[PDB]
Amino acid sequence: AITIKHAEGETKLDKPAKKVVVLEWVYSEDLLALGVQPVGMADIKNYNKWVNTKTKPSKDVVDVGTRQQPNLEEISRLKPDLIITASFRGKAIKNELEQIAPTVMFDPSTSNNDHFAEMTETFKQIAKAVGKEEEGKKVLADMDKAFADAKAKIEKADLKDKNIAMAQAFTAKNVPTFRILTDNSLALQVTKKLGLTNTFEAGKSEPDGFKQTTVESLQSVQDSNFIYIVADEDNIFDTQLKGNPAWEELKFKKENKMYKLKGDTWIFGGPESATSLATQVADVMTAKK
Amino acid sequence: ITIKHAEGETKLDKPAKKVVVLEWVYSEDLLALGVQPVGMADIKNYNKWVNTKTKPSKDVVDVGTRQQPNLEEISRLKPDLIITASFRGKAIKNELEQIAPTVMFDPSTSNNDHFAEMTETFKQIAKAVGKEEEGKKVLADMDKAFADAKAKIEKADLKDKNIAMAQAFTAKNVPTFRILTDNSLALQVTKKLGLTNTFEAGKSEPDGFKQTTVESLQSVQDSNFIYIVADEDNIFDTQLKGNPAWEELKFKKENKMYKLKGDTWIFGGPESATSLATQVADVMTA
Ranges for the Fe/B12 periplasmic-binding domain (chain B)? Predict the structure, then answer.
């Protein structure tokens, strides 16, 4: 009678789930980190393209459909014993998914935001729901060593400016869009473990961990280091900015304080995405010393 | 002439006569007074998305996108005065002042409350061009247009005067909603028409809205829903015509939804504001 505490409260499970359906990428990456293959999964194609962690979904999992509109018909057809989704897009159809199986719902702002705290608590609660409580802390102890070795390269390769600003970038309706992350976000919570300091919007936190805006907002952090992920086909990203003085004459671009990570890095992911981000930051920024 | 704008102060020795506009709300402000700019950004869908009744002639020349106006053409226009948003001009502020006196506004100078900054930017632009008397005209007609509106919604009494407004469109083919907040220009207008917004209540977004998806509409399920599709219409009901969390919304299957016209630029000036008023009062009563 294992007991799962999630955002929307409590859902008891008789036995650890073996046939599980995941309706968000973070929760899917969590189950795959625990060596558990789902039975259904939303948006697998663009998960393999944009999350792209080391434990990929197997072909035996079916595409449930879009994360926006899960195909309720073919969730039931698989008779899962546990459904995991975000409470944001779960309460929308909570009764309709609870009637297939016990349903658990997590929300990134469950512990004063701190999306890293909520990321780990949700990841362990999923390990307990799946019976992989020991495979859980191995995955998480591995991430703690990774944040240590990343921090190690930051001090033996010394720089003065510990200041950085991070953004996830894409193109939307033909304008380069920036999700500039704030203190409470998971990705900047990782960078703080490496001794870095985010300069975007100070002690202000946004409940979703970023501000979605345009290149014009980059002026306020233009003196810091810029780390960004282009989670879109980036050939258009530069083309829409290559003639733009808001982008070209930005101070960290002139001083080559720009560090473009790979678009592969899903900053809203779980433990495998947090390790990859950490060691990516340590290697791009300590490539000069 | 000395003006007051978001990025400091500027002084015009003579009332402006040869103006370049880089944002639509200030285009509408400029045209609503009877003064034609010499250059303006993005005419075609400006006339499509704002579609102000005083239209820009072909005497005005398109100096590029609001996002990136190719500043060579604006230079060869030798303007009397340049208007843009401080948000869009801060990155290039230097390059403009090399060309002509540049002044820049931002919806936040009135501690947001985007209605207050709109009308005050209007009077400041009126003082710049020297058409202060026309300014009083356009503003007074607006307050009256608000009164007839405000009067119509009570000649038919109503209880659930809770509204929720949103600008909607598709993005990465996800139905996206710009659900407006209490300090937006739009909700300040309906506030004085007798309606009360229910989305995020006593909270202020500096943008006057929150960009989100369908799921956020549950928070204002019990209110009246007012929206404008800033996107081609058949595209709008892209993924919602059969989508729960849109179907089981209380205001839908009870048809407490009222759809404004697509060319209702809720981020515009006084005439866009009046148009908002009389529209809401129209479809609310219906």
Answer: 18-286
CB-CB neighbors (< 8 A) of B68 in chain A: 243-244, 246
**Which contiguous run of DSSP H or E holds residue B238?**
none
Structural domains of chain A, with CATH: 1-106 (3.40.50.1980), 107-289 (no CATH)
Alpha helices in B76-172 (DSSP H): 86-89, 93-97, 114-129, 132-155
As a dihedral over the C-alpha atoms of residue B32, residue B37, residue B40, residue B42, rounded to 10 degrees, the angle is: 40
Resolution (A): 2.5
Q: Do B239 and A175 touch (CB under 8 A)?
A: no
**Residue A131 DSSP SS3:** coil
Q: Tell me the Cα Rg of chain B.
A: 20
The pair of structure tokens assigned to B247 is: 């179907």
> By the 8 A CB rule, do A285 and A159 touch?
yes
Instruction: Give per-residue burial for A185-196: e unless 16+ CB within 10 Å, then b.
Output: bbbbbbbebbeb
Burial of B126 (0-12, 13-18, 19+ CB in 10 A): buried
- Under DSSP, is residue B76 helix (H, G, I), strand (E, B) or coil? coil
Task: Tell me the residues of B at the A interface, defined by beta carbons under 8 Å apart.
Answer: 67-68, 87-88, 90-92, 95, 169, 171-172, 174, 211, 213-215, 218, 239, 242-245
